[PDB]
Amino acid sequence: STGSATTTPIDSLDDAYITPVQIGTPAQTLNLDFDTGSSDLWVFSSETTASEVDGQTIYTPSKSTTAKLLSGATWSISYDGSSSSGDVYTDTVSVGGLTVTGQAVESAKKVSSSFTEDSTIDGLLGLAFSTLNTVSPTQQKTFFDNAKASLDSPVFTADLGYHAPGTYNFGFIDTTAYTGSITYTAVSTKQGFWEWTSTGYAVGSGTFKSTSIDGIADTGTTLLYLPATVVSAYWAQVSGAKSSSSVGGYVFPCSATLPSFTFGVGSARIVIPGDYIDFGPISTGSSSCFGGIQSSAGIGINIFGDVALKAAFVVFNGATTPTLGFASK
Ligand SMILES: CCC[C@@H](NN)c1nnnn1Cc1ccccc1
């Protein structure tokens, strides 16, 4: 089997991407944030505290003839400071024509304010390794983990758009969706993430610096978080850019034209255009703009979030030894 679904930015800044997901019988379609950095499929629901729902579409398990309460099971996740928790159903879940029966659907009883305030995101669909799933007392599998054995090939791909729709495919690699070749690189699953090591970077037309940068491929993170040395080298090329303690990261004059940023994947190179690094005014009407490359110092891990991933066609290879692949597009 295969599946193919379009993923759409939630706003004009590409803050996150939503993908329609069919849950239950008859189908209830919710727009979920596919997150390769976490491992829970959770949804706003008829059980979510009413004051914490503000425009989201909810899952109502009592209206699904295939929903079954997973007795005794609860979940709770803390992400960036946001959080959510609740109970668990199993139900039929379909993405882009690929169906899993008996998928754990984590129904929120509580969500934190940042979820409530984002009317466009009806929940998360985790695509990291199932060892990070939070369901207790019996940990549950991700959608991909449940689908894997049925897929034509045990893979999914992320093809995120810049200010435009893109695609998540399951079970096949669309050879028309990228240019050149896919370069594969080793993954460590020891922290539950799609963790890999970039071979270095360049700023604009500058010379490539060969250096190992260990980080995660995370579709659920907006920005690119890298070591402070790398980030300082980038922003030094932008007149007037500065790290602002009060704003919480590097800011730059909105009048600037930003340089590109290149990252290494083996001997291959992925180029992030400068415009992908502009996240617009820090507050409405300001002429100070927020940067899309930020320090990972104090996160504890480097994060190749959407800023980086949307410059590439990315293969999440869930073979017995997982690997990642990157191609230009
Ligand atoms: C180890 C990160 C996992 C990641 N899952 N999408 C996440 N989970 N919660 N937030 N993120 C992103 C983030 C965290 C800290 C600072 C900036 C971005």
From Swiss-Prot:
Disulfide bonds listed in the record: 254-289
UniProt GO BP: proteolysis
Alphabetical UniProt keywords: Aspartyl protease, Disulfide bond, Hydrolase, Protease, Signal, Zymogen
Reaction it catalyzes: Hydrolysis of proteins with specificity similar to that of pepsin A, prefers hydrophobic residues at P1 and P1', but does not cleave 14-Ala-|-Leu-15 in the B chain of insulin or Z-Glu-Tyr. Clots milk
Sequence ranges assigned to domain Peptidase A1 in this UniProt record: 17-327
A GO molecular function held by the record: aspartic-type endopeptidase activity
Positions of the catalytic residues: 35, 198
First-tier enzyme category under EC: hydrolase
EC number assigned by the record: 3.4.23.22
Homology family: Belongs to the peptidase A1 family.
Protein name (record): Endothiapepsin
Gene: EAPA
